[PDB]
Ligand binder design. Structure first.
Ligand SMILES: Nc1ncnc2c1ncn2[C@@H]1O[C@H](CSCC[C@H](N)C(=O)O)[C@@H](O)[C@H]1O
Length: 262
């Protein structure tokens, strides 16, 4: 490929192990998960601390108005459930239907009593790419597995956009936020263009995303030129090669615990 993002990927792939570890978190915001990991290792159920690094990323978007979760939420590819627990804790959300393939080899939902947990219907063993869409007010999808080969990552990003098209066809007025793993690949730009033309939206980079991923989130609630957004992010990731900062350490998000009714 002949984009700045492809140059970034080639530089990332040619790093030595020491270069990679020195690069991946430079200037990156990172939640302190020492205590959360200790609770999860013990299998504590009564915890409101995030079950994954995903919760703070969705929170970062919600707190800024780049998404506003309400009504019936669907979480496609929920993994441990960090986005599902975040959504369940929002007073405006009435229910969460969370789907993930799970089992051995993939992350299974972590069963905790984080605030609103009882409003989540977790379904593991589910392939969301072959599942029929249903009613939703908000569609979330955090799917996109990293891979050294940007061709694979582009195909995975494209499949997620196609999945979002199917859910938005079912729910034309639903809000939608989804991960775009490799937004610089031309078939991905093309799919995002087609999505944005019909449904609106734009891309945003959360500060928790490491320099070792080009992931950006598409939200229908924001706007902005896709090509410029992607190239600006590529240039920033290229600039961070040789950045001498460490991570910017912040507390992990704590949603509190407890049920909620209606
Ligand atoms: N085809 C598929 N169907 C269902 N889940 C899938 C899938 N392909 C990948 N996944 C799941 O999608 C998840 C995305 S991980 C997302 C992190 C999550 N938002 C959190 O906050 O915890 C992974 O656990 C992966 O196993």
């Amino acid at each position: 490929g002949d984009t700045l993002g492809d140059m970034w990927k080639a530089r990332l792939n040619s790093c030595t192990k020491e270069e990679f570890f020195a690069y991946r978190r430079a200037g990156v915001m990172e939640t302190d998960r020492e205590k959360a990991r200790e609770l999860l290792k013990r299998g504590e159920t009564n915890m409101g601390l995030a079950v994954s690094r995903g919760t703070s990323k969705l929170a970062w978007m919600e707190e800024r108005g780049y998404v506003t979760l309400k009504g019936e939420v669907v979480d496609l590819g929920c993994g441990r459930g960090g986005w599902s627990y975040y959504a369940a804790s929002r007073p405006a959300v009435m229910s969460v239907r969370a789907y993930t393939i799970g089992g051995k080899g993939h992350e299974s939902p972590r069963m905790v009593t984080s605030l609103g947990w009882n409003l989540i219907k977790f379904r593991a063993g589910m392939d969301v790419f072959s599942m029929e869409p249903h009613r939703a007010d908000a569609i979330l999808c955090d799917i996109g597995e990293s891979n050294p080969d940007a061709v694979v990552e582009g195909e995975r990003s494209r499949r997620v956009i196609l999945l979002m098209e199917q859910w938005k066809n079912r729910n034309p007025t639903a809000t939608c936020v989804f991960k775009v793993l490799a937004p610089y690949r031309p078939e991905v730009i093309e799919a995002l263009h087609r999505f944005q033309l019909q449904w609106g939206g734009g891309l945003v980079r959360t500060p928790f995303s490491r320099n070792s991923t080009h992931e950006m989130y598409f939200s229908t609630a924001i706007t902005g030129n896709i090509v410029n957004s992607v190239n600006i992010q590529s240039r920033k990731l290229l600039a961070r090669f040789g950045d001498q900062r460490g991570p910017t350490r912040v507390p992990e998000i704590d949603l509190g615990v407890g049920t909620r009714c209606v």
